[PDB]
């Protein structure tokens, strides 16, 4: 709004009283966002003597029973009460004393007016020999800080001589053994190891406004989540609230979880699984996307980073959120599963698209077993399955149940097919029977189509007995079958044979002796689709 003619000649003095230090659970004396002040609009060029005189009348106390301690920022980022000499600096301006700080905050120390009535007065402070210390009591049972006021103490005073005051102010029985710490700054609470020394030795850079945090040395402290003041402040410093959303639930508002920035994957999962009444092993988490919102890349269960590492891209404004999903299997096995898409050839000689999920480290047997569990077999068939490999409508291979799945081609040009072994093909006479690959082709051998299949052929068998065996499987009209042309194919070369000749010798379909690698001779079926 509109500024006054002399508004620039004024400054704001914020007076904080000791009652504002009670109940504070964080570092330093109070929270800048929760603290309540007495605000003074003071001339920048008016003296300290005037303010101390004015303030005493305003606050309702004699001038000699009040002492001002300006709130001062320290090099380490803390704000603490500092010493101010009213006798020496009484004629100095408010602006030169604040060192151009506006608003200037000052701690106002006063006697308890209840005690003042019972004789009490503000003691004299020897700026060269005395120190003003603040006392806090940490209670591991309630995991909280209790304010125990301040003391005027000589710098040369032994720590051991401060223990009766601490016990008294905390409500402990005298000669209770205590653990003492110096609250240096956030995430730095240094234990006082020797009490038989002066304050100047005991504390690093002994100053006015220094804090000693103390607690009982009790075995019951160990029963607490945070047994020491040191662990309390560390937990306070690293504390972070994160929202967790289910990736599978659309527009899920999520739930808030209080975690620590230094938590590992196991610790983050264990805490979220407790809130979901699930096993941490049955949860998958996703990284952040940084710029974009929504879930990012899936987080490996063996992630070696911290929660800080996961939340580093959220801006100060940005609310911290992480996405997850609930699994119906252990995370380790879920990560190791392979999506195996194949064809299932049913009893009716019809093809069906099936997706099986064996473990990537499994074998052909495991894929077949997964399939056996999913389908209905023949009326009274073998109950044994096989995995074929088809490329360009031809069977290029029959895989043994012992073969690793990792060996099977990931290429899109391969078609893997599972089927039930026909009764006649379970245990053939190795001396006079043979399994041959059959495939349909239109005019030219390269022009293959249809569903290929394995066929049993016998030594010196009548080729029409082979023909009716083919007809019984294909199952079409007898006049459609008479149009067919039967030929044997091997390495491009193909010879057509007479249906009435009946010439069947296993050597005609066998490859060269000792060559199993070379594409074995097959039987072609000429017609059109
Ligand atoms: Cl942190």
UniProtKB/Swiss-Prot annotation:
There is a cross-link at residues 315, 328 (Glycyl lysine isopeptide (Lys-Gly) (interchain with G-Cter in SUMO2)). Expressed in neural progenitor cells (at protein level). Widely expressed. Overexpressed in prostate cancer. The modification N6-acetyllysine is found at residue 315. There is a cross-link at residue 315 (Glycyl lysine isopeptide (Lys-Gly) (interchain with G-Cter in ubiquitin)). Isoform 1: Phosphorylated. Isoform 2: Not phosphorylated. It comes from the Eukaryota. Residues 68-247 are annotated as: Interaction with ICP0/VMW110. Induction: Up-regulated in regulatory T-cells (Treg). Down-regulated during neural progenitor cell differentiation. It is found in: Nucleus; Cytoplasm; Nucleus, PML body; Chromosome. The modification Phosphoserine is found at residue 409. The C-terminus plays a role in its oligomerization. Monomer. Homodimer. Part of a complex with DAXX, MDM2, RASSF1 and USP7. Part of a complex with DAXX, MDM2 and USP7. Interacts with MDM2; the interaction is independent of p53/TP53. Interacts with DAXX; the interaction is direct and independent of MDM2 and p53/TP53. Component of a complex composed of KMT2E/MLL5 (isoform 3), OGT (isoform 1) and USP7; the complex stabilizes KMT2E/MLL5, preventing KMT2E/MLL5 ubiquitination and proteasomal-mediated degradation. Interacts (via MATH domain) with KMT2E/MLL5 isoform 3. Interacts with OGT isoform 1. (Microbial infection) Isoform 1 and isoform 2 interact with herpesvirus 1 trans-acting transcriptional protein ICP0/VMW110. Binding to ICP0/VMW110 may modulate the substrate specificity or activity of USP7 to stabilize viral proteins. Hydrolase that deubiquitinates target proteins such as ARMC5, FOXO4, DEPTOR, KAT5, p53/TP53, MDM2, ERCC6, DNMT1, UHRF1, PTEN, KMT2E/MLL5 and DAXX. Together with DAXX, prevents MDM2 self-ubiquitination and enhances the E3 ligase activity of MDM2 towards p53/TP53, thereby promoting p53/TP53 ubiquitination and proteasomal degradation. Deubiquitinates p53/TP53, preventing degradation of p53/TP53, and enhances p53/TP53-dependent transcription regulation, cell growth repression and apoptosis. Belongs to the peptidase C19 family. It is linked to Hao-Fountain syndrome: An autosomal dominant neurodevelopmental disorder characterized by global developmental delay, varying degrees of intellectual disability, autism spectrum disorder, poor or absent speech, and mild facial dysmorphism. Most patients develop seizures. Additional variable features include hypotonia, hypogonadism in males, and ocular anomalies. This is Ubiquitin carboxyl-terminal hydrolase 7. The chain holds residues 560 to 1083 of 1102 of the full protein.
């Amino acid at each position: 709004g509109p500024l006054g003619s002399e508004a620039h000649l004024y400054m704001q003095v914020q007076i904080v009283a000791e009652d504002q230090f009670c109940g504070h659970q964080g570092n330093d004396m109070y929270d800048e966002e929760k603290v309540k002040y007495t605000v003074f609009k003071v001339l920048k060029n008016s003296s300290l003597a005037e303010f101390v005189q004015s303030l005493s009348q305003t606050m309702g106390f004699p001038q000699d029973q009040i002492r001002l301690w300006p709130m001062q920022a320290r090099s380490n980022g803390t704000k603490r009460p500092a010493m101010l000499d009213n006798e020496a600096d009484g004629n100095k301006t408010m602006i030169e004393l604040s060192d151009n700080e506006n608003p200037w905050t000052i701690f106002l120390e006063t006697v308890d007016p209840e005690l003042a009535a019972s004789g009490a007065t503000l003691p004299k402070f020897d700026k060269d020999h005395d120190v003003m210390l603040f006392l806090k009591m940490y209670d591991p049972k309630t995991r909280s800080l209790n304010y125990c006021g301040h003391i005027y103490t000589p710098i040369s005073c032994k720590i051991r001589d401060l223990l009766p005051v601490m016990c008294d102010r905390a409500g402990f029985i005298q000669d209770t053994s205590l653990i003492l710490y110096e609250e240096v700054k956030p995430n730095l609470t240094e234990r006082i190891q020797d009490y038989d020394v002066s304050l100047d030795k005991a504390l690093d850079e002994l100053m006015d406004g220094d804090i000693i945090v103390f607690q009982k040395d009790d075995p019951e402290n160990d029963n607490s989540e945070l047994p020491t003041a040191k662990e309390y402040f560390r937990d306070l410093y690293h504390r972070v609230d994160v929202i967790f959303c289910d990736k599978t639930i659309p527009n899920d508002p999520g739930f808030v979880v209080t975690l620590s920035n230094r938590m590992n994957y196991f610790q983050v999962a264990k805490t979220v699984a407790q809130r979901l009444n699930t096993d941490p092993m049955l949860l998958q988490f996703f990284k952040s996307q940084g710029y974009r919102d929504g879930p990012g890349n899936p987080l490996r269960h063996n992630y070696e980073g911290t929660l800080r590492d996961l939340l580093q891209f959220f801006k100060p404004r940005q609310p911290k959120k992480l996405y997850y999903q609930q699994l119906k299997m252990k995370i380790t096995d879920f990560e190791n599963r392979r999506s195996f898409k194949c064809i299932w050839l049913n009893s009716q000689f019809r093809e069906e698209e099936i997706t099986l999920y064996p473990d990537k480290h499994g074998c052909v047997r495991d894929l077949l077993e997964e399939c056996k569990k999913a389908v209905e077999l023949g009326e009274k068939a073998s109950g044994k399955l096989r995995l074929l490999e088809i490329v360009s409508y031809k069977i290029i291979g029959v895989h043994q149940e012992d073969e690793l799945l990792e060996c099977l081609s990931p290429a899109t040009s391969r078609t893997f097919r599972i089927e039930e072994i026909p009764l006649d093909q379970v245990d053939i006479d190795k001396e006079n029977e043979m399994l041959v690959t059959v495939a349909h082709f239109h005019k030219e051998v390269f022009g293959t189509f249809g569903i290929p299949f394995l066929l049993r052929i016998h030594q010196g068998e009548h080729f029409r007995e082979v023909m009716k065996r083919i007809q019984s499987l294909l199952d079409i009209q007898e006049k459609e079958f008479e149009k067919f042309k039967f030929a044997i194919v091997m390495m491009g070369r193909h010879q057509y044979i007479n249906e009435d000749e009946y010439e069947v010798n296993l050597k005609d379909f066998e490859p060269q002796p000792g060559n199993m690698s070379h594409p074995r001779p097959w039987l072609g079926l000429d017609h059109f689709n």
